[PDB]
């Protein structure tokens, strides 16, 4: 309930940008492989 600045910045970055294996940084089996991500 304080509306802090730096805290807002950190949660913002964690909020944005998916990252993960995709982007930058047997059919049901592929379905499960995606579903985990």
Partner 1 sequence: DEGRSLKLNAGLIFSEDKRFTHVVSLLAYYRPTKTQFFTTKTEYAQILAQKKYFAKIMALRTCTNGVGWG
Partner 2 sequence: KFINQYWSQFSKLVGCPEDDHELTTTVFNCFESNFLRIRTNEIFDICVLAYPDSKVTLLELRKIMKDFKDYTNIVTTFLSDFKKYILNPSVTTVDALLRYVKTIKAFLVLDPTGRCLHSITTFVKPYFQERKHLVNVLLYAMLDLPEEELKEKINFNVDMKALLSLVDTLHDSDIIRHAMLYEHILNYYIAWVPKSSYIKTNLFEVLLDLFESREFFISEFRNLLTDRLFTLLDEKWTRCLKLIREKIVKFTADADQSNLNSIDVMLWDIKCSEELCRKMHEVAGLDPIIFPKFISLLYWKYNCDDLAFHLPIDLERELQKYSDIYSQLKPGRKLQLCKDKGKVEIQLAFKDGRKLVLDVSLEQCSVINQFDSPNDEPICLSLEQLSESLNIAPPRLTHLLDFWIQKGVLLKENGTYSVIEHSEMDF
Q: How many residues are recorded in the chain?
A: 37
**What gap in Å lies between CA 17 and CA 11, rounded to an integer?**
12
Site mask for partner 1 (CB under 8 A), range 1-37, x = bound: --x-x--x---x--xxxx---xxx-------------
Give, as ranges, the residues between 1 and 37 that touch partner 2 (CB under 8 A): 9-10, 12-13, 16-17, 24-25
The nearer residue to partner 2, 25 or 32, going by C-beta atoms, is 25
For residues 3 and 25, what is the distance between their CA atoms, to the nearest angstrom?
A: 30
Cα separation of 20 and 37, whole Å?
A: 8
Positions touching partner 2 (CB under 8 A) are: 9-10, 12-13, 16-17, 24-25
């Amino acid at each position: 309930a304080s509306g802090d600045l730096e805290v807002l910045r950190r949660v913002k970055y964690l909020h944005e940008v998916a990252s993960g294996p995709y982007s930058d940084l047997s059919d049901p089996t592929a379905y499960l492989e995606d579903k985990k991500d």
